Symmetry: C2
Subunit: 178 residues, 2 copies
Protein backbone atom coordinates (compact mmCIF):
# COMPACT_ATOMS: atom_id res chain seq x y z
CA UNK A 1 0.00 0.00 0.00
CA UNK A 2 2.01 2.85 -1.44
CA UNK A 3 0.90 6.43 -0.97
CA UNK A 4 -0.82 7.69 -4.13
CA UNK A 5 1.82 9.10 -6.53
CA UNK A 6 -0.49 11.30 -8.64
CA UNK A 7 -0.37 13.84 -5.74
CA UNK A 8 3.40 13.92 -5.03
CA UNK A 9 5.98 16.53 -5.91
CA UNK A 10 9.65 15.87 -5.36
CA UNK A 11 12.39 18.19 -6.63
CA UNK A 12 16.00 19.07 -6.07
CA UNK A 13 17.59 22.11 -7.61
CA UNK A 14 21.21 22.63 -6.81
CA UNK A 15 21.55 22.53 -2.99
CA UNK A 16 17.87 22.37 -1.77
CA UNK A 17 15.61 19.29 -2.07
CA UNK A 18 11.88 18.88 -1.27
CA UNK A 19 9.83 15.73 -0.95
CA UNK A 20 6.21 16.80 -0.82
CA UNK A 21 2.63 15.57 -1.10
CA UNK A 22 -0.73 16.90 0.06
CA UNK A 23 0.11 16.61 3.81
CA UNK A 24 3.94 16.42 4.05
CA UNK A 25 6.64 18.96 3.11
CA UNK A 26 10.13 17.63 3.72
CA UNK A 27 13.19 19.84 3.04
CA UNK A 28 16.84 18.79 2.97
CA UNK A 29 19.78 21.06 2.21
CA UNK A 30 23.46 20.91 1.35
CA UNK A 31 25.97 22.86 3.37
CA UNK A 32 28.96 20.52 3.41
CA UNK A 33 26.85 17.44 3.42
CA UNK A 34 23.19 16.86 2.54
CA UNK A 35 20.91 16.59 5.56
CA UNK A 36 17.32 16.87 6.62
CA UNK A 37 16.53 20.49 7.49
CA UNK A 38 12.86 20.59 8.37
CA UNK A 39 9.63 18.75 7.81
CA UNK A 40 6.03 20.02 8.10
CA UNK A 41 3.01 17.75 8.57
CA UNK A 42 -0.65 18.45 8.10
CA UNK A 43 -1.56 15.02 9.27
CA UNK A 44 0.44 11.90 9.74
CA UNK A 45 -0.56 8.95 7.53
CA UNK A 46 0.45 5.28 7.25
CA UNK A 47 1.56 4.39 3.81
CA UNK A 48 4.84 3.89 1.94
CA UNK A 49 6.30 6.76 -0.08
CA UNK A 50 6.77 5.51 -3.64
CA UNK A 51 10.29 5.10 -4.99
CA UNK A 52 9.19 6.72 -8.24
CA UNK A 53 9.04 10.02 -6.29
CA UNK A 54 12.13 9.39 -4.10
CA UNK A 55 15.55 10.97 -4.62
CA UNK A 56 18.74 9.24 -3.39
CA UNK A 57 17.14 5.87 -2.72
CA UNK A 58 20.06 3.56 -3.61
CA UNK A 59 21.25 1.47 -0.69
CA UNK A 60 19.25 2.95 2.16
CA UNK A 61 19.43 1.79 5.80
CA UNK A 62 15.80 2.28 7.03
CA UNK A 63 17.20 2.78 10.60
CA UNK A 64 18.83 6.04 9.48
CA UNK A 65 15.50 7.48 8.17
CA UNK A 66 14.42 10.30 10.51
CA UNK A 67 10.78 10.23 9.49
CA UNK A 68 9.91 6.49 9.80
CA UNK A 69 9.14 4.77 6.53
CA UNK A 70 5.88 3.36 7.97
CA UNK A 71 4.46 6.88 8.23
CA UNK A 72 5.30 7.81 4.64
CA UNK A 73 8.86 8.88 5.43
CA UNK A 74 10.68 8.84 2.08
CA UNK A 75 13.16 6.02 1.74
CA UNK A 76 15.78 8.58 0.81
CA UNK A 77 19.20 9.58 2.05
CA UNK A 78 17.89 13.14 2.11
CA UNK A 79 15.79 11.94 5.11
CA UNK A 80 18.81 11.86 7.49
CA UNK A 81 20.75 13.70 10.12
CA UNK A 82 24.09 12.73 11.56
CA UNK A 83 23.72 11.34 15.13
CA UNK A 84 20.04 10.34 14.85
CA UNK A 85 18.31 7.14 13.98
CA UNK A 86 14.69 6.78 12.94
CA UNK A 87 12.27 8.68 15.21
CA UNK A 88 9.64 5.98 15.50
CA UNK A 89 8.67 7.19 19.08
CA UNK A 90 8.26 10.86 18.23
CA UNK A 91 5.05 12.64 19.23
CA UNK A 92 3.38 11.45 16.00
CA UNK A 93 -0.15 11.28 17.42
CA UNK A 94 -0.63 15.07 17.23
CA UNK A 95 -1.69 17.12 14.16
CA UNK A 96 0.12 20.12 12.55
CA UNK A 97 3.64 18.95 13.64
CA UNK A 98 6.93 20.66 12.66
CA UNK A 99 10.29 18.87 12.78
CA UNK A 100 13.51 20.83 12.66
CA UNK A 101 16.91 21.23 14.33
CA UNK A 102 16.95 23.92 16.92
CA UNK A 103 16.73 24.33 20.72
CA UNK A 104 13.43 24.20 22.49
CA UNK A 105 12.93 27.66 24.14
CA UNK A 106 14.75 27.85 27.44
CA UNK A 107 16.55 24.52 27.09
CA UNK A 108 20.19 23.41 26.70
CA UNK A 109 21.60 20.09 25.34
CA UNK A 110 24.93 18.46 26.22
CA UNK A 111 26.62 15.67 24.33
CA UNK A 112 27.99 13.19 26.84
CA UNK A 113 28.13 9.46 27.37
CA UNK A 114 26.71 10.11 30.95
CA UNK A 115 23.26 9.85 29.53
CA UNK A 116 20.54 7.29 29.13
CA UNK A 117 19.81 5.54 25.79
CA UNK A 118 17.09 6.43 23.23
CA UNK A 119 13.58 6.52 24.57
CA UNK A 120 10.18 7.94 23.65
CA UNK A 121 10.07 11.67 22.95
CA UNK A 122 9.69 13.82 25.97
CA UNK A 123 7.98 17.14 26.06
CA UNK A 124 9.89 20.01 27.61
CA UNK A 125 7.07 20.91 29.98
CA UNK A 126 6.26 18.68 32.88
CA UNK A 127 2.81 17.25 33.45
CA UNK A 128 2.07 20.34 35.63
CA UNK A 129 3.77 22.74 33.22
CA UNK A 130 7.28 23.27 34.60
CA UNK A 131 10.10 23.70 32.10
CA UNK A 132 12.80 20.98 32.07
CA UNK A 133 15.81 23.14 31.22
CA UNK A 134 18.77 20.65 30.88
CA UNK A 135 19.10 17.80 28.38
CA UNK A 136 21.67 15.30 27.20
CA UNK A 137 22.42 12.74 24.52
CA UNK A 138 25.09 10.08 24.01
CA UNK A 139 26.19 10.91 20.41
CA UNK A 140 23.57 13.06 18.67
CA UNK A 141 24.66 16.14 16.61
CA UNK A 142 23.73 19.73 17.51
CA UNK A 143 21.55 21.72 16.98
CA UNK A 144 19.10 19.12 18.39
CA UNK A 145 16.22 17.30 16.73
CA UNK A 146 13.03 19.21 17.65
CA UNK A 147 9.29 18.43 17.33
CA UNK A 148 6.68 21.17 17.85
CA UNK A 149 3.06 20.26 18.37
CA UNK A 150 0.05 22.45 19.27
CA UNK A 151 0.54 21.82 22.91
CA UNK A 152 4.35 21.67 23.36
CA UNK A 153 8.02 21.40 22.28
CA UNK A 154 9.47 17.88 22.23
CA UNK A 155 12.95 16.44 21.71
CA UNK A 156 14.16 13.56 19.51
CA UNK A 157 14.45 10.07 21.05
CA UNK A 158 18.21 10.44 21.57
CA UNK A 159 17.89 13.47 23.81
CA UNK A 160 16.97 12.80 27.44
CA UNK A 161 15.88 15.14 30.20
CA UNK A 162 18.17 16.02 33.12
CA UNK A 163 16.36 16.23 36.42
CA UNK A 164 17.49 16.69 40.06
CA UNK A 165 14.08 16.57 41.91
CA UNK A 166 11.01 14.29 41.49
CA UNK A 167 9.28 15.13 38.21
CA UNK A 168 6.36 13.80 36.14
CA UNK A 169 7.32 13.49 32.46
CA UNK A 170 5.05 13.81 29.43
CA UNK A 171 6.27 11.26 26.86
CA UNK A 172 5.10 10.17 23.42
CA UNK A 173 2.64 7.32 23.76
CA UNK A 174 3.02 6.12 20.16
CA UNK A 175 5.25 3.92 18.13
CA UNK A 176 5.37 4.13 14.36
CA UNK A 177 6.52 0.50 14.24
CA UNK A 178 3.43 -0.46 16.53
CA UNK B 1 -1.67 33.73 -12.34
CA UNK B 2 -3.58 31.02 -10.54
CA UNK B 3 -1.77 28.37 -8.54
CA UNK B 4 -1.53 25.15 -10.56
CA UNK B 5 -4.69 23.05 -9.97
CA UNK B 6 -3.27 19.65 -11.02
CA UNK B 7 -1.57 19.53 -7.56
CA UNK B 8 -4.50 20.57 -5.30
CA UNK B 9 -6.68 18.49 -3.03
CA UNK B 10 -9.73 19.99 -1.39
CA UNK B 11 -12.28 17.91 0.53
CA UNK B 12 -14.99 18.22 3.11
CA UNK B 13 -16.55 15.22 4.77
CA UNK B 14 -19.22 15.96 7.29
CA UNK B 15 -17.75 18.47 9.80
CA UNK B 16 -14.02 18.69 8.75
CA UNK B 17 -12.75 20.47 5.60
CA UNK B 18 -9.21 20.62 4.11
CA UNK B 19 -7.84 22.86 1.40
CA UNK B 20 -4.46 21.48 0.46
CA UNK B 21 -1.71 21.61 -2.15
CA UNK B 22 1.99 20.72 -2.17
CA UNK B 23 2.95 23.41 0.41
CA UNK B 24 -0.29 24.39 2.23
CA UNK B 25 -2.61 22.34 4.48
CA UNK B 26 -5.59 24.35 5.66
CA UNK B 27 -8.17 22.78 8.03
CA UNK B 28 -11.55 24.19 9.04
CA UNK B 29 -14.04 22.51 11.33
CA UNK B 30 -17.66 22.74 12.41
CA UNK B 31 -18.55 22.94 16.07
CA UNK B 32 -21.54 25.29 16.04
CA UNK B 33 -20.25 27.27 13.16
CA UNK B 34 -17.59 26.52 10.53
CA UNK B 35 -14.26 28.19 11.21
CA UNK B 36 -10.60 28.00 10.38
CA UNK B 37 -8.88 25.64 12.80
CA UNK B 38 -5.26 25.46 11.70
CA UNK B 39 -3.05 25.94 8.70
CA UNK B 40 0.43 24.51 7.99
CA UNK B 41 2.86 26.01 5.48
CA UNK B 42 5.94 24.53 3.90
CA UNK B 43 6.66 27.72 2.10
CA UNK B 44 4.60 30.74 1.39
CA UNK B 45 3.91 31.45 -2.30
CA UNK B 46 2.26 34.26 -4.28
CA UNK B 47 -0.47 33.01 -6.48
CA UNK B 48 -4.27 32.81 -6.44
CA UNK B 49 -5.97 29.62 -5.26
CA UNK B 50 -8.26 28.46 -8.06
CA UNK B 51 -12.02 28.57 -7.52
CA UNK B 52 -12.29 25.11 -9.09
CA UNK B 53 -10.66 23.77 -5.88
CA UNK B 54 -12.43 26.16 -3.44
CA UNK B 55 -15.36 25.24 -1.20
CA UNK B 56 -17.85 27.89 0.00
CA UNK B 57 -16.75 30.60 -2.42
CA UNK B 58 -20.11 32.32 -3.05
CA UNK B 59 -20.15 35.94 -1.95
CA UNK B 60 -16.83 36.23 -0.16
CA UNK B 61 -15.49 39.40 1.50
CA UNK B 62 -11.68 39.14 0.89
CA UNK B 63 -11.14 41.22 4.11
CA UNK B 64 -12.50 38.32 6.18
CA UNK B 65 -9.97 35.82 4.69
CA UNK B 66 -7.44 34.92 7.41
CA UNK B 67 -4.77 33.70 5.02
CA UNK B 68 -4.54 36.60 2.49
CA UNK B 69 -5.70 35.75 -1.00
CA UNK B 70 -2.46 37.14 -2.48
CA UNK B 71 -0.48 34.36 -0.80
CA UNK B 72 -2.71 31.58 -2.09
CA UNK B 73 -5.24 31.87 0.73
CA UNK B 74 -8.39 30.15 -0.56
CA UNK B 75 -11.19 32.54 -1.37
CA UNK B 76 -13.45 30.47 0.85
CA UNK B 77 -15.66 31.07 3.85
CA UNK B 78 -13.86 28.16 5.49
CA UNK B 79 -10.86 30.56 5.66
CA UNK B 80 -12.37 32.64 8.52
CA UNK B 81 -12.51 33.21 12.22
CA UNK B 82 -14.89 35.43 14.09
CA UNK B 83 -13.16 38.64 15.31
CA UNK B 84 -10.28 38.57 12.80
CA UNK B 85 -9.75 40.18 9.45
CA UNK B 86 -7.16 39.17 6.88
CA UNK B 87 -3.67 38.69 8.37
CA UNK B 88 -1.73 40.47 5.65
CA UNK B 89 0.99 41.59 8.20
CA UNK B 90 1.60 38.19 9.75
CA UNK B 91 5.17 36.87 9.99
CA UNK B 92 4.89 35.48 6.44
CA UNK B 93 8.59 35.87 5.58
CA UNK B 94 9.58 32.77 7.58
CA UNK B 95 9.43 29.12 6.42
CA UNK B 96 7.64 26.14 8.11
CA UNK B 97 4.90 28.34 9.72
CA UNK B 98 1.89 27.00 11.69
CA UNK B 99 -1.28 29.04 12.22
CA UNK B 100 -3.79 28.04 14.87
CA UNK B 101 -5.88 29.37 17.75
CA UNK B 102 -4.23 28.93 21.07
CA UNK B 103 -2.19 30.93 23.63
CA UNK B 104 1.48 31.55 23.12
CA UNK B 105 3.29 29.83 26.07
CA UNK B 106 3.29 32.05 29.12
CA UNK B 107 0.97 34.70 27.68
CA UNK B 108 -2.56 35.95 28.44
CA UNK B 109 -5.01 37.90 26.19
CA UNK B 110 -7.77 40.28 27.28
CA UNK B 111 -10.62 41.54 25.15
CA UNK B 112 -11.07 45.24 25.84
CA UNK B 113 -11.60 48.44 23.93
CA UNK B 114 -8.59 49.91 25.93
CA UNK B 115 -6.31 48.62 23.26
CA UNK B 116 -4.59 49.85 20.15
CA UNK B 117 -5.83 48.99 16.62
CA UNK B 118 -4.51 46.23 14.29
CA UNK B 119 -0.82 46.37 13.55
CA UNK B 120 1.95 44.11 12.26
CA UNK B 121 2.38 40.81 14.08
CA UNK B 122 4.49 40.97 17.15
CA UNK B 123 6.61 38.19 18.45
CA UNK B 124 6.18 37.29 22.10
CA UNK B 125 9.89 37.57 22.84
CA UNK B 126 11.56 40.93 22.91
CA UNK B 127 14.55 41.77 20.78
CA UNK B 128 16.76 40.63 23.73
CA UNK B 129 14.59 37.59 24.48
CA UNK B 130 12.29 38.67 27.32
CA UNK B 131 8.75 37.29 27.33
CA UNK B 132 5.92 39.83 26.87
CA UNK B 133 3.30 38.19 29.08
CA UNK B 134 0.13 40.40 28.71
CA UNK B 135 -1.83 41.09 25.52
CA UNK B 136 -5.05 42.72 24.42
CA UNK B 137 -7.40 43.15 21.49
CA UNK B 138 -10.43 45.35 20.77
CA UNK B 139 -12.91 42.68 19.52
CA UNK B 140 -11.07 39.50 18.54
CA UNK B 141 -12.43 36.05 19.65
CA UNK B 142 -10.57 33.70 22.01
CA UNK B 143 -8.57 31.46 21.89
CA UNK B 144 -6.26 33.89 20.03
CA UNK B 145 -4.86 33.74 16.52
CA UNK B 146 -1.32 32.29 16.78
CA UNK B 147 1.63 32.02 14.36
CA UNK B 148 4.62 29.79 15.16
CA UNK B 149 7.84 30.17 13.24
CA UNK B 150 11.25 28.52 13.76
CA UNK B 151 12.42 31.34 15.90
CA UNK B 152 9.29 32.40 17.87
CA UNK B 153 5.57 32.60 18.73
CA UNK B 154 3.66 35.52 17.19
CA UNK B 155 0.15 36.90 17.60
CA UNK B 156 -2.44 37.96 14.99
CA UNK B 157 -2.59 41.64 13.93
CA UNK B 158 -5.54 42.34 16.24
CA UNK B 159 -3.68 41.35 19.39
CA UNK B 160 -1.31 43.95 20.83
CA UNK B 161 1.34 43.68 23.51
CA UNK B 162 0.87 45.23 26.97
CA UNK B 163 4.02 46.79 28.34
CA UNK B 164 4.82 48.89 31.46
CA UNK B 165 8.61 49.52 30.95
CA UNK B 166 10.68 50.47 27.84
CA UNK B 167 10.79 47.48 25.48
CA UNK B 168 12.12 46.70 21.99
CA UNK B 169 9.52 44.82 19.93
CA UNK B 170 10.13 42.31 17.15
CA UNK B 171 7.42 42.88 14.52
CA UNK B 172 6.64 41.37 11.13
CA UNK B 173 8.42 43.32 8.43
CA UNK B 174 6.20 42.08 5.60
CA UNK B 175 2.93 42.90 3.98
CA UNK B 176 1.11 40.43 1.79
CA UNK B 177 -0.58 43.33 0.01
CA UNK B 178 2.98 44.93 -0.58
Amino acid sequence: DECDGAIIGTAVKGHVAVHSDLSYWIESRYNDTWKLERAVFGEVKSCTWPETHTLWGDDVEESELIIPHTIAGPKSKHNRREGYKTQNQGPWDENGIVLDFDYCPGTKVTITEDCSKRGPSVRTTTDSGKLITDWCCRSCSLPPLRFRTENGCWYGMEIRPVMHDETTLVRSQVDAFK
